[PDB]
Amino acid sequence: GVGISTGTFNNQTEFKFLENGWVEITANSSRLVHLNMPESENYKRVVVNNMDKTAVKGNMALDDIHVEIVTPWSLVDANAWGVWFNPGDWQLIVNTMSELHLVSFEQEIFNVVLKTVSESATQPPTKVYNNDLTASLMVALDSNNTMPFTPAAMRSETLGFYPWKPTIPTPWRYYFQWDRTLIPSHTGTSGTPTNVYHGTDPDDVQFYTIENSVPVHLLRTGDEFATGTFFFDCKPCRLTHTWQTNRALGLPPFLNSLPQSEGATNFGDIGVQQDKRRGVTQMGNTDYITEATIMRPAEVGYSAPYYSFEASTQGPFKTPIAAGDPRYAFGRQHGQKTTTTGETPERFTYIAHQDTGRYPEGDWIQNINFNLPVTNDNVLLPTDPIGGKTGINYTNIFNTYGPLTALNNVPPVYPNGQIWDKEFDTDLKPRLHINAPFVCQNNCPGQLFVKVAPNLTNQYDPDASANMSRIVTYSDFWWKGKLVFKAKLRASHTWNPIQQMSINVDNQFNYVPNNIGAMKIVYEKSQLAPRKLY
Amino acid sequence: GVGISTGTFNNQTEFKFLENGWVEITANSSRLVHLNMPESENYKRVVVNNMDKTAVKGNMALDDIHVEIVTPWSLVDANAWGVWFNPGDWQLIVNTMSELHLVSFEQEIFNVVLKTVSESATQPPTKVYNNDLTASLMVALDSNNTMPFTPAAMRSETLGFYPWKPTIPTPWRYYFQWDRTLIPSHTGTSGTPTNVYHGTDPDDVQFYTIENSVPVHLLRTGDEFATGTFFFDCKPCRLTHTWQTNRALGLPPFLNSLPQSEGATNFGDIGVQQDKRRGVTQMGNTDYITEATIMRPAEVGYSAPYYSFEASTQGPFKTPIAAGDPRYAFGRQHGQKTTTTGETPERFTYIAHQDTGRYPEGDWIQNINFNLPVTNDNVLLPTDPIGGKTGINYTNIFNTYGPLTALNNVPPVYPNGQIWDKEFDTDLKPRLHINAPFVCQNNCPGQLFVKVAPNLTNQYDPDASANMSRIVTYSDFWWKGKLVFKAKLRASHTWNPIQQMSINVDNQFNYVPNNIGAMKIVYEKSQLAPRKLY
Amino acid sequence: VGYSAPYYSFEASTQGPFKTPIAAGDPRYAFGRQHG
């Protein structure tokens, strides 16, 4: 079946309007993947140590020591908005829909090709490329999710973001258990602190192998491989933002005095002594009913320790937060001006709100007796130092998460954000994930692994440390996916128009190529349109 | 039926999504109309003369002389976008739809009320208002369009634009035939030019009366009046704009030399001698194939005489144009800051494009022999004077309308634009109307006329020039309409996002009221989204 | 309503000059005996 294609190229996205303001978005995405022979046909357990870095009292956060099992397989990840939608599409989705539902997903590998490089060592010397018509491309689709979940979006290693630009899969590797101790220290810290990699705990050792836990298919040119259709089990993602804070929840105080002429200084006036007002308060002490005192239903948002690093058996790690900022570093293949030189990533900090965010500088604590103006001794301000440290206040320690905490889930981040994420297999689970807006609880699509089957030479001896020598082979194959969403059309509820993504005299050139054909994909806001929270 | 309401107030707009990217927009609009007794119960033929103004050699365009028949009836006009949609709605329609179809229209008059004012001439003196429970409000709906078509949008005299602000109908009046001569003159013109109103031509006299050609209903409080549903016969209005001009129609010339490094000065190069190129030209003379010479299918847009005033039996009038600018003057009730003082209208010049527009300064004409660089004697430029006038060039006279003229229809102008317009009853008709995007050819909704029936006093004598004296009466009544459109949802066809109406840190306050409750409705662009013309 | 056109304009094509026709408002009818 050499002279016959086994698939079709399709990179169109279709919006099929169903019944009652609900539409069905079908994002088709296909690409040409380039894959090289494994640098090593073996599984390696590799340790990464960098104490020297962390050895510098004050450089703890720069800790990279970990252990990973390097597999001879590559992973074809497409989990990132940039892989399915282009700027124009994102505008549409983001501007006219009000919520998105992730529905199904399927992939296929067609028109497989395997070539061979001959080093025609003549003069220059030359180099030749030929077709190995009988060579095979190994494919494995871990449907039962046996293998560790390794989303490539976290290291900006997904498939390209341009339909017309060949891409490639990423070398697959996963974490291996290890013990490590690193004790905090600042510039002044005396003597060498404790910084040591202890090793591996036998009881947590898990050496995974694809061969052993997943059936492998060998695809020759004539062959093709197709995944079935997976249907997710995720909650709907919203494309609306709330803005209210406890200070804007409920019936505003009745103004007994209203302005009588336009004017920035023409304010209205409640017109009632702060301690002779009616209403509800949760302060059994005072008779003071103020906008900061009046009782609200619950609390929109919470406060958490900032730049807090906790430690467990593998080392320190930043205490994650649900507030509002992700920082995305990437490049060339996923945005970053294509013609850009050097090897410095491009990046952005997607800022998302005032929906649950906090201004620490505005926080403060007072003595139960109240008694204002409050005395310095009865107030702990975000200015008074903790532990004697000049740069540490109670807020860095503070946590106001509790039974009344209201909160929203992560918004979509085009085009660098991950789309769906697998849930933790713990008995109690995170009320949300910080990395993706969609989390398949029970079932998530299985990972797809590719690998160029070993093209041996006439000389091969299993019983020899040597290192099998094989014909230089590589494979190019097309990949095609289909991600289906279900979305609801938004409606206008206010008299005033609203936030909409548009092209300006300023963005204009972030959506077109240049005289050299350089390109780039700029990030974009996703939940632009207020929604009444209460 | 005095103590019982006869209608419901509804000012909601509903979008009902049907099948296949088509939605049904139902704009409901109801309002409280205030109506006063006729200043005169009679029909008057009134002449308006202002020669003194036009008598000033050079002030011809300021000619207002006309004759009109003043009727004792008021007209309830709702034909203007501002009456049916608010800013938020217009954004939705304009941003997500790709074409609009005017479908049906119906009105109703309910909860009629008639009051009487008593001048309690005590001290101040006082004033009293009472209910005339047996008084009637006269209503007439000219279904057969017997009466002259007088759209109130042309003089900014529609119903209000705010649901919560009582409005009023406009005194109805229509043109009466008259003869008038006014001869052009400029400041220097010598002797008094000819400026005279000749009178009326018996053969064109048409004195229209509602009583005589329309059935009138008398509505007392308990009564209510409802129009049936009219279905228009108009072409679809587009919500997309084209941008191509003959210079951008077709296969661009093949560049034999392309840039090799980014750079504003790194241009591509056709790479072929202008007279040794292949292609098609409509210039049988030259061998010059240039972007301004190469042959295009037809012509996008045309050129017409500018600030041309033509004259017919009623006087001078500006020669109308289909190009791209309307100027809208209005106020208070239809936009203009509500609290604004004085009596100076608010206004704007809706600029709409580069779709068919022309830059006269760029036009020029040359001798058939061609022969360039062209000699002054073989070129008439938009600079060389015509008729000796320093400020007149051939372009002011010029007209390039013909068999190849491509062209689009008027876009919607929110909120001051008229919605539909009646077609001329001439054997040959305008390929379009400059005042509205929708033109019912055969059938247009009939005009609705209101009038407070005469509340006579005990003293009334028909046979006396006097002037019937009647009890001071006035009526308030609610009006409610329903305009239905059918629209298609737009799709993304380019890789780049597109123009979208949005709220900025700049418009923000054009969509909210002030501390005094002042309000205003700012105009907005309608066909924002390119469409491939060819 | 109506338009303006060049008056007493004669154009020429392969058979000679001819008055540029108009849609405005006047026909002139010359006849005799048998038709009035």
Entry keywords:
part of a larger assembly; 27% strand; eight-stranded antiparallel β-sheet; 5 helices; 534 residues; 3 chains; Empty Capsid Viral Protein 2; mainly beta; six-stranded antiparallel β-sheet
* CATH homologous superfamily grouping of chain A: Parvovirus coat protein VP1/VP2
Number of DSSP strands of chain A?
A: 26
- Measured distance between first and last alpha carbons of chain A: 63 Å
The third-level CATH topology of chain A is Empty Capsid Viral Protein 2
Radius of gyration of chain A: 29 Å
Taking the sheet with the most strands of chain A, its summary is: 8 strands, antiparallel
Helix content of chain A: under 10%
**Main interface pair?**
A-B, 45 and 45 residues
Using the alpha-carbon principal axes, give the shape of chain A: globular
- The level 1 CATH classification of chain A is Mainly Beta
Strand content of chain A: 25-35%
User: Regarding quaternary structure, how should these chains be classified?
Assistant: part of a larger assembly
Distinct helical segment count of chain A: 5
Number of domains of chain A: 1
Please state the structural category of chain A. Answer: mainly beta
CATH architecture of chain A: Beta Complex
Characterise the protein shown here:
Chain C: It comes from Feline panleukopenia virus (FPV). Chain C: It is found in: Virion. Chain C: Belongs to the parvoviridae capsid protein family. Chain C: This is Capsid protein 2. This is part of a larger assembly, with 3 copies of chain A. Chain A has one domain: Parvovirus coat protein VP1/VP2 (Empty Capsid Viral Protein 2, Beta Complex). Helix content of chain A is 5%, strand content 27%. Chain A has helices at 51-54, 81-84, 87-96, 210-213, 394-397; strands spanning 13-17, 22-36, 44-48, 66-75, 97-118, 128-131, 137-142, 170-175, 179-182, 195-199, 216-219, 225-226, 230-231, 237-238, 299-300, 309-312, 315-318, 327-330, 346-349, 365-366, 379-380, 405-406, 420-422, 438-440, 447-452, 473-489. In chain A, the strands form 8 sheets. In chain A, strands 1, 2, 5, 6, 12, 13, 14 and 26 form an 8-stranded antiparallel β-sheet that branches. In chain A, strands 3, 4, 7, 8, 11 and 25 form a 6-stranded antiparallel β-sheet that branches. In chain A, a hairpin with a 4-residue loop joins strand 1 and strand 2. Chain A is globular. Chains in contact: A-B, B-C. The A-B interface holds A 15, 17, 19-21, 86-92, 95-96, 258-263, 266-268, 339, 489, 491-503, 507, 511-512, 514-516, 518 and B 15, 17, 19-21, 86-92, 95-96, 258-263, 266-268, 339, 489, 491-503, 507, 511-512, 514-516, 518.
